[PDB]
Amino acid sequence: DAVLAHRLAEIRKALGHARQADVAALMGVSQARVSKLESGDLSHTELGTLQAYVAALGGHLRIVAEFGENTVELTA
């Protein structure tokens, strides 16, 4: 049962153990950069940035588009 995230930081908080500093260091950016990212709109977040953020958290992105009762997976 998936938890819902309306904000980038809610993805991290769902895991519990990964602090903001942890994700920054794993992404290889300053914590100031991650604080900036987490204060923004999810809709204006770049896909590459989202990918790196989720990867730093130990996960991977599934990008799906539902068409009718079918679903296509985007591999980009």
Add this chain to the structure above:
Amino acid sequence: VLAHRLAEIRKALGHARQADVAALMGVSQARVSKLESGDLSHTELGTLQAYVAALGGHLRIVAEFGENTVELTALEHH
């Protein structure tokens, strides 16, 4: 069910051409062209949302963490 390219998706799921999608999104055909050709690393989530929506579909993004899963909402611009 798998697609390396946005264009692949468009062409299999109907008959919309690039100018059709551009009009639906209210963006340049250039932008749509770069979407389907270029690398999506610097593409905003809301832009991808709008593209899939113009094709008549619904974008879902899921962060998969093994036994746990986080689904993103509010992917739409406004």
